[PDB]
Amino acid sequence: TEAETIQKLCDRVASSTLLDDRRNAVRALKSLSKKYRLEVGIQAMEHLIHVLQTDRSDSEIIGYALDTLYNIISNDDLGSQFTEIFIKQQENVTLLLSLLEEFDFHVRWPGVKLLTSLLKQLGPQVQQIILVSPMGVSRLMDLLADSREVIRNDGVLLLQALTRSNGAIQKIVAFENAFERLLDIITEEGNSDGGIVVEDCLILLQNLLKNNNSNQNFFKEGSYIQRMKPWFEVGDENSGWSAQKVTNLHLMLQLVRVLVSPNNPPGATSSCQKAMFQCGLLQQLCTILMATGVPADILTETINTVSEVIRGCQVNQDYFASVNAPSNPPRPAIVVLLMSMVNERQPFVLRCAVLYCFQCFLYKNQKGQGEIVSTLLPSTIDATGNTVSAGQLLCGGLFSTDSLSNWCAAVALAHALQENATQKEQLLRVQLATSIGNPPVSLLQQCTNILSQGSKIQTRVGLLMLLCTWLSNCPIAVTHFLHNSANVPFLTGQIAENLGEEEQLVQGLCALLLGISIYFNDNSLETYMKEKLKQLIEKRIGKENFIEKLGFISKHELYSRASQKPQPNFPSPEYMIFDHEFTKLVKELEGVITKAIYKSS
């Protein structure tokens, strides 16, 4: 029986009076830790611990005790329960911290590996023991300063486990110089060309910053954002990028994004956007955005990063508009964006990213909005220099046969109009170039006409989000809409029908559009005053029925997700239904429209 033989090694370790004997026993008990743990765990563990408490004068036996404990605890779920047994006595963890003050390799290295495993398996509990132990975090931070690369590198992994989801420890590590030290490890290792140690440092940096407002502030106020610029100085290569270089650069971009996340306190993102402009980071990122031979996944992530760097920041938005591609007719980055978005051939995730970048370029940027719309107006301002305009590309996508391009172009245009009173009115002057035989038709009416043409649902959702955005807060748009006599009957007909579930969303959007045409109706068009439209709802469809159908939009499965996330990074083309900003409009208007409809007078 092994339970007995290991009991004899246990009693030797415990009772044996000479160091040499105890040591050979621990060494053998080690043999039985790998390939045989369970008894060793339940019968050797407290003796191995006793060797750590006594016997500290012999590095060799301590080494073996820790290697054996590592083997009891680590999984390369037995590992979980042995961890719980180990830490029952919290002094067992503080004893490990004491041992980590020793520099002898055979003590230090296994100590680091064991405490890392404990930390990975029972994070919150082990972290708490370390946090309240005097000098506990300090002794671990100092592992980064060990002369031996193997220890320093395993120290980074330990500190990932220590900092994970622990605000208090993250703040201590920041005060103890972690940002400078980790950035310097990355520089020395060669930035994104630096292999797995760089990846590990970047992961630790993410633990230090993600969901940590105080550390993001420390990062910014410590003038560390400028240290991120060299990371994106990639140019000598641009064909044979290793998988590890891609992994590193992806993490580096994610770090940039943490600092300008739309979910931060607004002042934090804004102040970081400014700092990124001042040290040349934004400019450097736009350089990779316009380079050649950048792997698809980096290109997409870089576009999504630049998006958040510019989002709502006038100086940065204006910088982005000044960026040109290196072509014989210089071509704005914005045009290069829109080309890709409506390119039926490009990868879906790239088309989504380019849409995000365009939305963020326009966000709170009335100047940019007016620049886009003005390319659609009969105004011979020298558009040449770049012959294809942003407006021409959006019209092409709007009326192309590809529903994805229809949706993206309609949403891109809605973002050009949103909260812009002037551009909503300007866009009403746009008349489509019609092909031979066809009568003239306004852009507004043509968008509307497409809704009754057997177009795909996706096409019609996009056009309806556009039309709702256009008419919202714009009585003159409402009048131009209502003045074409086909529009109200069409809307009431669509809403009144008893169609399948997928078609219900279109019905709901039709109800929103009809509601907008009541709520924002200035009663200047005798044919369709508010009371006439309301009586029409009652007769053709019924007031309660109207509201049920209006309610379909916000009750849709994908609506909740679109409302929470600004990024349009849908899983696949069939999920491309709702725009985030559009969800804000529905939230703003559904309630007040509902009240307007139920009102009697």
From Swiss-Prot:
Chain positions of ARM repeats: 3-43, 44-90, 92-132, 135-176, 177-222, 224-279, 280-323, 332-377, 389-428, 442-482, 487-540, 542-599
Chief localization: cytoplasm
GO MF annotation list: identical protein binding
Positions where Phosphoserine occurs in the chain: S33
Keywords, comma-separated and alphabetical: Acetylation, Coiled coil, Cytoplasm, ER-Golgi transport, Golgi apparatus, Membrane, Phosphoprotein, Protein transport, Repeat, Transport
Segments passing through the bilayer: none
Topology in membrane: Peripheral membrane protein
Chain positions with N6-acetyllysine modification: K171
Family to which this protein belongs: Belongs to the VDP/USO1/EDE1 family.
Name the UniProt record assigns to this protein: General vesicular transport factor p115
Organism: Bos taurus (Bovine)
First and last residues shown, out of full length: 18 to 632 of 961
